[PDB]
Design a protein around this ligand. Sequence first.
Ligand code: 3PE
Ligand code: 3PE
Lengths: 68, 220, 123, 459, 12, 125, 100, 178, 87, 124, 76
Amino acid sequence: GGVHIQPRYREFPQLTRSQVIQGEFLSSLMWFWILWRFWHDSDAVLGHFSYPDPSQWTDEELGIPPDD
Amino acid sequence: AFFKAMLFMCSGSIIHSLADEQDIRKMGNITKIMPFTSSCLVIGSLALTGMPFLTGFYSKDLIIEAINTCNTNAWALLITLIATSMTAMYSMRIIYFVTMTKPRFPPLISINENDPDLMNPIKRLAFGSIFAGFVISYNIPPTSIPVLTMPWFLKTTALIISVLGFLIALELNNLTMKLSMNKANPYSSFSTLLGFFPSIIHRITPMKSLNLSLKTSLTL
Amino acid sequence: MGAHLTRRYLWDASVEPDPEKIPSFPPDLGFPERKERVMVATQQEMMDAQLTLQQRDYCAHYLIRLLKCKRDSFPNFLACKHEQHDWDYCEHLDYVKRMKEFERERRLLQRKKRRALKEARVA
Amino acid sequence: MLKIILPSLMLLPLTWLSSPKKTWTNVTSYSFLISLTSLTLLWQTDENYKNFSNMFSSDPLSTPLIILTAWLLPLMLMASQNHLKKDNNVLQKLYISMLISLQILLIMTFSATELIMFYILFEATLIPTLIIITRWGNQTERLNAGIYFLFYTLIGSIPLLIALILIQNHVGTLNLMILSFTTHTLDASWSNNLLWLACMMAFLIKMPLYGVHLWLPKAHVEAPIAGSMILAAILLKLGSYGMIRISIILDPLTKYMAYPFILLSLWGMIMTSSICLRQTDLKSLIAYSSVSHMALVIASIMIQTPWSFMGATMLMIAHGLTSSLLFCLANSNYERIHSRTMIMARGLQMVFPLMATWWLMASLANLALPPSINLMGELFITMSLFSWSNFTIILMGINIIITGMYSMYMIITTQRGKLTNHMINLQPSHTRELTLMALHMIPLILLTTSPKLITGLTM
Amino acid sequence: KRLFVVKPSLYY
Amino acid sequence: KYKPAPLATLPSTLDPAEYDVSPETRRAQVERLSIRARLKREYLLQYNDPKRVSHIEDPALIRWTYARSANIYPNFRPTPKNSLLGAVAGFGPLIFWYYVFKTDRDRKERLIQEGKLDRKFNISY
Amino acid sequence: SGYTPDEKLRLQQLRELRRRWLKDQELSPREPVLPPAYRSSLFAVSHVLIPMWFVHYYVKYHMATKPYTIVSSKPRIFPGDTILETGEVIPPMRDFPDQH
Amino acid sequence: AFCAPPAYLTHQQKVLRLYKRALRHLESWCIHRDKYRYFACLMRARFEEHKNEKDMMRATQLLREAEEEFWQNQHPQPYIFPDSPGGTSFERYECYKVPEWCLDYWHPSEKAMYPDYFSKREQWKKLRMESWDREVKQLQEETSPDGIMTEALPPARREGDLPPLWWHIVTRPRERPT
Amino acid sequence: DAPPLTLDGIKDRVLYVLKLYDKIDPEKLSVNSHFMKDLGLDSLDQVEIIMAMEDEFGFEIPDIDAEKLMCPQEIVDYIADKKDVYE
Amino acid sequence: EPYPDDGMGYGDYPMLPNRSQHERDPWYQWDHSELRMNWGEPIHWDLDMYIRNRVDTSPTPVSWDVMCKHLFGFVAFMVFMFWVGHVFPSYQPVGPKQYPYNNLYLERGGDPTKEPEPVVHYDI
Amino acid sequence: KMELPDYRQWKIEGTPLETVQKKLAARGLRDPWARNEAWRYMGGFAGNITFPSVILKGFKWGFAAFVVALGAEYFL
Ligand SMILES: CCCCCCCCCCCCCCCCCC(=O)OC[C@H](COP(=O)(O)OCCN)OC(=O)CCCCCCCCCCCCCCCCC
Ligand SMILES: CCCCCCCCCCCCCCCCCC(=O)OC[C@H](COP(=O)(O)OCCN)OC(=O)CCCCCCCCCCCCCCCCC
């Protein structure tokens, strides 16, 4: 009636089954998705292309001539 | 749109469930009292902080590394990255004060979020916040010819700065609990009264624009 | 965000390549008839695939493939994955070029400094 | 055009002959139909002007107005049924007839081929207006206001009389048709530089310019609602209609003789717009809103580019309808409140829910909300003014920001906030008050659907 | 305990 | 030290007077309540009066509007600092913009005359 | 301080009257005297299909008919497709060197 | 809001009203309850000492340096309650607090329904007119001799009489019409 | 959302809080019992009491109206009058 | 204290303290609630400005000067630093991007008839 | 009518208020309103909430689910 969820005074509000399950549900799917994609597609941190060391290019390759 | 909408309705849930308290100071421990919104709030918070593999991550780090790779103002490049760490900080500020702390709400507690009209939409957007970045990025037409080739520090900069951001704020907030009031308001005031643009440019312009009409243009 | 900048903003910029004018030195310097680039796609192919001008790179050819496998395979947006690696690679293999060119320049300018310093400036 | 006019004259016999109790409905019902006959002039199937007969003509510029002039007589007679319902049954039939003669005269002035027919009818409209303002004016100062309204117009009027008789001798007929198809090119002498000022000044005065607009704030303040509607909706626009038809001659001088007015108007637009920002009398604020939004018009009838002209024609018809709507709702607050002060009467939406919707739409018409002819008008004058000199956007740009501020302030401090504690309790809204409004805005919505009809002569 | 909610007259 | 400016004024607290009050001051303070209490018990007995339909007037607002729009010109005396400042305001910008618009309009005209202004795809005006 | 003994009676009494006013504000039973479908399927179709039809009537018989009212970016044609109208088979592209 | 403002403020009410602003502006800087309940009983100490100073001059010299210490050690965004002036809900529901003299212009149709409501409303309006005379007379017979006059109004002082000027403190719009 | 107050639920909370203040004996607190003349508390403790109540019921008892919340009952009708509880 | 006699019209209207209705005690039952002004009390000349909406003269925890200096200091430092930036930009070690044909001369809408000076790009 | 928990139930020991209570005590001071602020830490809300706990809420099943899925893919 006037009480759909009894108010509580200085006590931990009682929680409904659904409130807890839906909350764990949304969070757990968040973690399943993060884990699933991390496994299937781990190119979020690494990147799938390795930076070349610009300082290891034989001068020949770069057309650097030998002081004429 | 997906995550910011979530966080605001998440706080809509907290404000309405509490006796219309709109201040983080009097709200606390919503995580145990209301797990459904707290779960939605952290999902949104991590999306805002660009958690890897969530909707923010697919678009946001593309923008970050774009900056780290283009020719740009040095001042702009540095501020945008620390702006990203601050986004983690204030994101941390909300969950620590609003969710992970001893409750400080008024003593009678009457919290209900069971109403389908609360959960359903919050639930539906949460599904969008979790999967939208995945769907939109793959489906859109190839565009912009991104540069995926970066030194690894720049490739992972968005991830680390966000992490370090949370860590720093965790430390700061946790430091707060000590029985030691020593904030000293070093620069909090700028930050707290909005950089003082509101205090000064809102009192001078409306004052020297109306004084001139009544006193000078109208009567003189 | 880089250290190359420090070499130029700090220290000396004489031997640091200008962000622009990268192909500053002769295009053939150090080259025995260097082969020019090769564009696989025909100008028309691109114009018929409505590739954004910017996306008309030397990788335009692997792109058109991706786009092909994205229109075909429509309901499935997760299956044109090999095509994307290819395009990206082509481009990584282009970014690297654009990096090799920059280094080249860098080194050549240093060559200028060393040469014109004692070979051509002291008797 | 003698159906828009003869049937009008006959209204006068009906206001007098009819029963004291039935006088109001016979007059209002019949002029609604008089407006319906007026709509026939809108049937133009070719670009040539409809010259009904020697003296009476209607071209795109006059037609959009003749219909408005006929339309407001019904409304004017509906807005003044309350005040003027305390009269002796012969003071009413005088007020009703006075209102009737205004549109008879105004319909003819807007539908006149000979420019001096304009002058005689032009300056006659002052007689009916001065009586409406002075005889029924509530405040002690209407004797003064009447003097200001008669002298500013009259001192401007005699120069135009001399100028038009002057051109008749120079050209040989004041017939707007011929004067247009004849070579009258002034010669940039010092004298002509005076002729131009003689012809434009009388029109520039009743179209309040920044220099001579003090007559309009004083006149609308103490004028009864019907007089204030007539002054804002049709009377001020008489000056604009005159400037459009008179500058056909004096073609060369306005290229360089306009700068003085143009700058007077654009700076005037800013200052008139701004003083609206802190004026305690609501009728005062609407009047200065009228000066500023009319200062834009004299700055488009002088730049003289096709777009200006129809920007002007769009805005004049649109602002006419909007201003009245604002003056009409101001009166409804004044009659219950019994004071013109803006600060009193706060929170009305809480007690008059709908009038507030009318207030909101009137304000959005007042400021330039986009799917409205009001915005199309300003957008066009703005464009041409920009063409005249790209810098003009700065001044026509301070006005837009100020216009938004005062328009919403009228809504924010009159129709929102906490209710006034206990002014004389505010009786609910009559259906007449609300219709008088609906009759103003429903046409504003309909005209915005097809702006072509009020676009002017230029386009 | 339904309570009467004063409202401006809303017939006009 | 807080420093009141014409804006951001000195708070009640932090105002010297509020702290050192002489017997004289207190008396004055007490009087000012009386004027207000008096005025308060006049409104209240005109507001709470059954059998009243007339408009409570608030003459203090009528003295304000009259002072602000009908008691101005009867108290006008043309001094300096008033006519110098009464001409810089009416003719100052009005002359400023004239040399802003003339110079632009003249620059435009010259360029059009000499053939430089592009006026491309401009088929309207 | 403490309430003045003559103000704890003007609040004593006026509170007593406010309590009666709020009681009187309560509505009696009957107080609001009233002056003498397939669920979503009455919507999905009635409120969506009905509008759709009209729209279609408008888009396929006014817009479509009038010139330049519904214009579309050219369709995309890649190397190897068969244009429906012409039947032309876009020629295959120069082999780009594989395994690059 | 209910009681009337005193003319001048005493020393006490100025001190004791700092104890409120101060402690309440200490719960913005110190949010957690524990830190607060600690850092605040330390505040009282500050006020607790210097409680018995008899030297007024001194007392008004501790007060004037307290309120400057405070002004410079205040929080810019303190915790002001939701429904109090300056709050977040202040005057929010005022758009629904119509002033009750408006049910008098209702159409006889509207008031036709809701009938017992108006049967009790007409009783109260009889109460209001039945006492205006005894009230105003009271207000006057008991008007103060010439001199200090505050805004405090008298109680009833006789049976049947209703506190003078009671029609708008009672019959005041409900706080939250909801 | 939450249920409205009552003149006996706004009285049990007011006595509750005060019974948790250490200085005020929890067995001599009676609603008609003045804070400063009968219970013993000082002036500074009235401010502290009122403030507790302002935080139990979530609203601010203005200064001038709260320099007088002496009886432990005034607090119970003032809170209720401010919240429109006609019981 | 009559407004100064300089003949600008004020007349005898009292020169009431220039304080906005914002800091008028927000709890007291002001007859006119929203103007926070009682009935009879002299209205201020500019009450159309210091009203609860338009302007706010109200004390601020930080002194006004301190505010004006700090705000603008921030603005300036920023603007300046942005300038230090444009002087010293951040750009990766990458040479210029290379577009095919003649930098897409024709497709950038170039004139079909007039061929452009070939711009060639070589490997490595 | 709503009842209210026995006032006695609340006690400062066992909560962070107790440590604040003991120090204020060294100073000789004693705060009298602590017990009121006890239910904050008293029960239900007594457990300390750690930041990893919120960020990692549901991770346990999320990974469990991750395993299951990868498994199905392995099973083909
Ligand atoms: C005439 C000179 C001036 C006279 C002023 C006073 C005249 C009063 C007496 C006469 C009043 C009616 C006659 C004058 C107005 C005539 C308006 C009209 O005829 O509308 C035409 C419209 C059909 O459109 P159509 O003419 O075909 O448009 C041309 C497209 N090529 O017909 C219709 O479809 C009507 C549709 C009605 C519903 C419209 C719904 C859309 C409204 C959009 C509003 C947008 C927001 C407006 C904001 C305003 C400011 C808040
Ligand atoms: C609010 C935003 C304002 C944004 C302003 C943007 C300005 C853009 C750059 C303008 C200046 C360079 C323009 C270059 C192309 C145009 C060249 C041209 O023809 O302009 C000429 C004009 C001449 O003006 P001036 O310097 O006065 O020359 C008088 C010589 N005797 O050149 C000028 O007009 C120079 C001055 C331009 C700005 C004029 C003021 C704009 C703001 C006015 C606000 C209201 C001011 C009221 C002042 C009242 C004073 C009493």
